[PDB]
A paper describes a structure:
We solved three structures from the polarized dataset: C4-symmetric up and intermediate structures with overall resolutions of 3.4 Å and 6.2 Å, respectively, and a C1-symmetric down structure from a symmetry-expanded particle set with an overall resolution of 6.8 Å. Compared to the up map, the down map shows a dramatic change in the bottom half of S4, near the intracellular surface. At the intracellular surface, the loop connecting S4 to the S4–S5 linker helix becomes lengthened by eight or nine amino acids. The lengthening occurs while the S4–S5 linker helix on the C-terminal side of W248, whose side chain density is apparent even at the lower resolution of the down map, remains unchanged in its position. The density in the newly formed extended loop suggests that as S4 moves downward, it forms a broken helix ~30° relative to the bilayer normal, and an extended loop. We built two tentative polyalanine models into the continuous main chain density, one invoking a three helical turn displacement of S4 and the other invoking a two helical turn displacement. One and four helical turn models are incompatible with the observed density. The three helical turn displacement, which would place Q3-R6 below, R2 in, and R1 above the gating charge transfer, more reliably accounts for density, but additional data will be needed to establish this conclusion. The position of S4 in the down conformation sterically occludes the PIP2-binding site altogether. Thus, while the voltage sensor is in the down conformation, PIP2 cannot bind to the channel and open the pore. At hyperpolarized membrane voltages (i.e., at the resting potential of a cell, corresponding to our polarized vesicles), the voltage sensor is in the down conformation, which prevents PIP2 from binding because the site is occluded.
The KCNQ1 Kv channel, also known as Kv7.1, is the pore-forming subunit of the slow delayed rectifier potassium channel (IKS) that plays an important role in the repolarization phase of cardiac action potentials. Importantly, KCNQ1 and other Kv7 members are regulated both by membrane voltage and the signaling lipid phosphatidylinositol 4,5-bisphosphate (PIP2). The voltage sensors close the channel at hyperpolarizing membrane voltages, while PIP2 is required for the channel to open. The human KCNQ1 channel was purified as a complex with the structurally obligate subunit calmodulin in the presence of Ca2+ and reconstituted into liposomes composed of 90: 5: 5 1-palmitoyl-2-oleoyl-sn-glycero-3-phosphocholine (POPC) to 1-palmitoyl-2- oleoyl-sn-glycero-3-phosphoglycerol (POPG) to cholesterol [wt: wt: wt] with 300 mM KCl.
Author numbering:
A (entry chain G), C (entry chain E), E (entry chain A), F (entry chain C): 104 to 396, 506 to 568
B (entry chain H), D (entry chain F), G (entry chain B), H (entry chain D): 6 to 149
Write the structure that this text describes.
């Protein structure tokens, strides 16, 4: 019963401080496994570490298998992961797929000497720490790399435009410098301009502010065109970083603007009630038709009235999820002013009746 | 769809009951007065700015047809009802307790009738397990 | 009839998903033509690719000609591109000019061996993918490179000021380092300071954070002045990228502030009606003069009243295109408050009459 | 321009009809009451903050001359009327249908008279093609 | 009396212009001590400066000791630093701990020849200038490096996410380039890919736009993957700088939004009065129970009423510290509108009584 | 009369399009003089250009002298630059000082062979183009480099803090790397760590992402500490650019928020009238004392009432120069609500009198 | 905590005095009318939006229990009272003068009674030093 | 400054005329009613939020002394009057025409009296040059 929920929160959805400590320990043991895998790649300790770390690696993979087993067993608490069908649905999740891929890659071959693939197999375990953030996996519209990567998605069109302009400038500039300096050979007897691949490489180097130190024309025309290219194109190349930072600060400012979490309960309840009203509009024999009261031939009228009430509830809920804003202030002032006008009109007509 | 457009046209004419081809706040309020739902002027202006799309503040036959032409099984609606039901489940695992639904539906909202709340309980029950799952209830919601 | 409109939307103004798929395929075939053109520049496949790709290149240029022909033929749907005069007007568009230039460059010479100009001719086809965004070409105030490049235009004065300050600092620092290190020769027996062109080049390298690795004084004074120059001037050099990113995030925030698209219809209709009212003010014999009703000598009065009504409509439309804002809230509160004051005053005077 | 300044000065004096050299909201409202256009106080304050430029809220002869001195064929006005007419054409290619213009001019705006709407149709018609083009209509608009 | 307060403001909490001048002189003498310490590290003046600067360094350390003594003696003005216990509490402050550490490091050994540790000891005095900003040390939630470093803390989660993604990309790209170019040796007979430490180093160089000039594959595949890595990962690496700049500009905009400093006095006074009301609710024999007036058995009622009044005062104070905002405007309009509705209702019922 | 004003606008304060064209031509001739001065520095054309350009340079300096003379003569239109005292005051302006310095530097020596100082003298003419923006010179609080450089001034404290932290990190890291790698010598037989000046230089190189290519330890500990230094300190170093860009976008957003220019006329007029009211409060014999009307002994009362009216006018003017804001909306709502409350109270008491 | 929940439940029932299990603004105002504290409708709505957390605008037993369950010695409250007392001390060193506290407590706030202000002086005095320190007063505040 | 503080204290007492040591909006409005300047409630609240600094909304002797202690020749005031006079000069070169000042001072503001406007003209005249310079007028403003 509740033990399944508690172990599910311990595994996937952290809460409190003990589960946070456990996740912290998981992150550190991931760091430890990655670090000894990467230190196993050195030639001096290639054999000693491989021989010594056999027991640790096998107990680690056994622990990973047991934790996957207990996670899938505890998945039964979630309504989406109930029964064999629910277990299969949980398997289709990207995090579960990645974990299963890691386990099968670990156990591809047994009782064999280690090779470079062993480091690659352990390298896949690096992304396991990021799976804790993506442990929710509620949907695919925005999650972890997509939830906070939506900043790129929000700016996708113009980011694509900027990178396209940068690529066009890079290839064009490479063509110009190649055509101009086909005959230009710098010191040390090396032909700087020998391949358009080299030209594109140096264009990338210049746009990335790398500055290797091998291929630079000493001609004044080349220096001037390179200076113009730097003062024109580097800003567009560096645009996306500041773009995403400014957009992220935008959404951070929007965070404090967000409306209180507990204020959407009446709106959601009204939405559900109107949804059922629409559903029972399909059933003339429902007991809800007697709430208004006889009335017999107005079934379609009641149905469409409930449908427009559901539309109004949808609009109210969509306004609720939006934070407090200038539009909200404007509509609040408008409704208050129209209520005041209606009250003034009714008072005026009442007084006219009284004294007229 | 000829029968559909005909029935919505005749319903629009019935609500108009005046021959000018437009639905007004006064006409709608008179309709609720005849049927007895106690409307509010705020609700009237709120449905006015919602259904009307031409920006003129009145209701027309093309606008009514366009607003009625929308479907009910949109994936956006599916996700919206998902997130609406998520907040009502404190655990958030799709298993919502019976008592919380009971007291919320009773004391919060528009004070829904007890008999129809019990109807909600009996149809939205996973074999009477108490800790019911709303996935099947939403699925039968979207299956019409 | 409608077929011309459908093919025009298929060609220029995309809609739906099939036209989006077609534009995607156009972008990929542009990528393919550019990629085989650039791979044709290699020396190992210079001849084999040229011999093989003759049929593909000729069918591609034939397809481009046919698509240009069908686009100009379908341009007749647009009111600006009707008839021979409309076709000529469509030709004057920058996108049409670029396409015609590309086609004529492709067909300059026939049945001739390929050269480096063939790669240049195919390089012009790279910008064709960007023409899809600029396919509108409604005006020249802001479009594609200018519409989203208005961020630079909005910041043009101060961007020019910053680049001017950077250029002054660069040239001045080059002069100081040359004068100080005229006698400074580093290792490997190379005179670092031999030309002010080299000095300006190294100034550009330092301001661009390139770091080639050839010309650096080993003097302590040179090191200190270079450190001061870096800590003073690099920020101004990198300013424009963050400037444009922050301004773009500004306009993104403004996007959600924008007023609903369908609310401007009554304002536009009133503007048109007032424009015609001004027009008919020029015609005393128009039937609109009888709408008010006799009145004979107030023709100028009616004309100027219609003119001021048109001015009011212009102001209302200009306020409409502006998004919801603090000014809108302030004016709404002001009009509501003055209406309340007028109503209170009329109620007070009515009561004074009633009981006085 | 002596006749122009003289005629605007005498028109300003006629509207003033009081000798203080200023146009007030009360005077303007009395003018509409005499002629019968049913003005609104909101419209009065809206024209006040528009025409007045000195910031004192009243109307002066130099202000009136300056506001009347503007031309009608400004390129900004051309582009503004371009974008205003663009939204009314769903296709956006300059070919606007007859029926859409008809029903919009009838039911939206200030309910323009049917005879003058038909006048609009007959003069703003490209040889009676139905799917008329507004470019020529705007050109004759700006040709005075 | 007041002399202790004046000297405390002279030492720790600057005010006026004379104390600002004194702090400026302190900053310049700190600059002087650091500069002669760093110039003492040169080999030509290692001995001459050490011999000459003995008197200056000893008088400087004596001055530091005397200023610490006078600061701790003047700390008695502060209520937190009264008596021996207050002096000990002042010692536990981080600034006092750093100063004591610097002094003891200076006086570790006497009458001994100088070494490299002397430069290190004087290097600790560099941070003394920053202690002037952190001289307040009111708390540890946000102070100096934390008060303006809260910008990082506000963005901590997503900054950690971005750096984690960058680190994953760096290590993965290093693995790919190593595996691909194990057999790739560039010119000058140097094995570029000889250690994964070198691979990670070059990954850091590429992500930092350093461009040393030693390890770059000349393969076309390597060039393309490096270009993709640059166009994909550099923006995420440069994200935090623009992120913090935009957030700082956000809080700068919030500064002008801040509510007036003198408006919180009534709210604070009401909060204190309600706190005492809660305190005296614990004492039924207090004289405050007679302010309302008998009433005997409503002691719990009065206690809970005072408690809810204290809760209301807490909410009002928490709203006060918040700047003027959309929520404040909305609640002000709501309270005004409800007051108007109540007044209209009472007027209507009064009129109904009058004429009914 | 008006000719002096017209020539003053032609020279200093541009307007229309002809003066803009003249300023554009001035900028281009400045570009021409700088470009031939910089091309005169080459060794191949050092003598030919010097011999040929004598007539052009002398006519250019004559033109500069004549334009300075006509500018100072036309300065008499400005009230600040009237008469000999006004001419002297105009001379003290920084732009006039710079122009006079340039002219005297040009004419230091006559009929002499050119040297490197001639290029330096012509280099000072580069800043003349920037003087057009600073031609106003109304004050020194904010002008050109200070008016748009106020972005730095607004962020001065925290920019200083960030650069101070970066400098501390740089010097500390240089000390650590020197102490760690005193014995580390890389390839080619060069001692990388031979001077703390070299250590500080490489710290600057690393923090500036330069990457020269000479001094890098090959030790794993050095690589790790360099990676940590890069991932920790580069963001703080790059902070100021994004900081200033975001602040500039902030003020750009504030530009559209700015209140209309013509609305401050009544506030300024009221301020002037109240200033004179305060002035005439000093004169009991002024005719303004009879405007209120006898009253004899209330002179001090009238004086202090006029003084508080002037204070109110000052507050109103200070609120006017502020753009439309949340505070403005709040105070407008407050005044409207209090007017409504007063009107309701007076109506209620009037009705109570009527029926009571 | 059984006695605690029982006493808060009975206090809630006593305030309700109607049997519907909810506290309303009318009931609370009647309570103050009975006891005589002259409430304000603004204060009533201000306590309504404060204590109520379900968003329905009424007071329930679970809400009352949750709001009463909070502790008084929270470190956030400690820091808040620190910064609240800081502004009242011009010096800001924790030594607050007697006269400033006297006149502020008298003329500012809700005009607290002189006898209880003197009680504040006598208990919040560091051995009658005049320039008293509020640290000990706050400590005995938080010690209950 | 003993005479200064004494005279401001007695002026404050005279305005109070009630003995409670505070100036209220009712008292100030009664003062203007006695002297006849036709005050406005908006102006009263505007001076209330201006002069009062304690945040309690009333006027106290220390507040009055602090607000009266400010000097008139502040450089901020100099620059503010500079920029205020700049907008009234269209040329912006410090030479302001006679007619513009005349008509602005007459028709804009609070309708200042013609005799005192002529006094302004005669004292703020650079030897009667017509195109007067306001620098000397501001200098004699700030010289008291």
């Amino acid at each position: 019963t509740h033990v399944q929920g508690r172990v599910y929160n311990f595994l996937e959805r952290p809460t409190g401080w003990k589960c946070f400590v456990y996740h912290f320990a998981v992150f550190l043991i991931v760091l430890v496994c990655l670090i000894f895998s990467v230190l196993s790649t050195i030639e001096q300790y290639a054999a000693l570490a491989t021989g010594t770390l056999f027991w640790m690696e096998i107990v680690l993979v056994v622990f990973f298998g047991t934790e996957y087993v207990v996670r899938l067993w505890s998945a039964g608490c979630r309504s989406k992961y109930v029964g064999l069908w629910g277990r299969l649905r949980f398997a289709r999740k990207p995090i579960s797929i990645i974990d299963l891929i890691v386990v099968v890659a670990s156990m591809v071959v047994l009782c064999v000497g280690s090779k470079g693939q062993v480091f690659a197999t352990s390298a896949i375990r690096g992304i396991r720490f990021l799976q804790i953030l993506r442990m929710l996996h509620v949907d695919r519209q925005g999650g972890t790399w997509r939830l906070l990567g939506s900043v790129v998605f929000i700016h996708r069109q113009e980011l694509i435009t900027t990178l396209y302009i940068g690529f066009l400038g890079l290839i064009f500039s490479s063509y110009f410098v190649y055509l101009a300096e086909k005959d230009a050979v710098n010191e040390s007897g090396r032909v700087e301009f020998g391949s358009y691949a080299d030209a594109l490489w140096w264009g990338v180097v210049t746009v990335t502010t790398i500055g290797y130190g091998d291929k630079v024309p000493q001609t004044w025309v080349g220096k001037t065109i390179a200076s113009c290219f730097s003062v024109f194109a580097i800003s567009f190349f560096a645009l996306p970083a500041g773009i995403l930072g400014s957009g992220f600060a935008l959404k951070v400012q929007q965070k404090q603007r967000q409306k209180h979490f507990n204020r959407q309960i009446p709106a959601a309840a009204s939405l559900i009630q109107t949804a059922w009203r629409c559903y029972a509009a399909e059933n003339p024999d429902s007991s809800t038709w007697k709430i208004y009261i006889l009335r017999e031939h107005h079934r379609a009228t009641i149905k469409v009235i409930r449908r427009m009430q559901y539309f109004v509830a949808k609009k109210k809920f969509q306004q609720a999820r939006k934070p407090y804003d200038v539009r909200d202030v404007i509509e609040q002032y408008s409704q208050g002013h129209l209520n005041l006008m209606v009250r003034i009109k009714e008072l005026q007509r009442r007084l006219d009746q009284s004294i007229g | 769809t000829e029968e559909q457009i005909a029935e919505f046209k005749e319903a629009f004419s019935l609500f108009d009951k005046d021959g000018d081809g437009t639905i007004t706040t006064k006409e709608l309020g008179t309709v609720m007065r005849s049927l007895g739902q106690n409307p509010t002027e705020a609700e009237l202006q709120d449905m006015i700015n919602e259904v009307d799309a031409d920006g003129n503040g009145t209701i027309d036959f093309p606008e009514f047809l366009t607003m009625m032409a929308r479907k009910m099984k949109d994936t956006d609606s599916e996700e919206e009802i998902r997130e609406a039901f998520r907040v009502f489940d404190k655990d958030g695992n799709g298993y919502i307790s019976a008592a919380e639904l009971r007291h919320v539906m009773t004391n919060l909202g528009e004070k829904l009738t007890d008999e129809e709340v019990d109807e909600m309980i009996r149809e939205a029950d996973i074999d009477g397990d108490g800790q019911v799952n709303y996935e099947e209830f939403v699925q039968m919601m979207t299956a019409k």
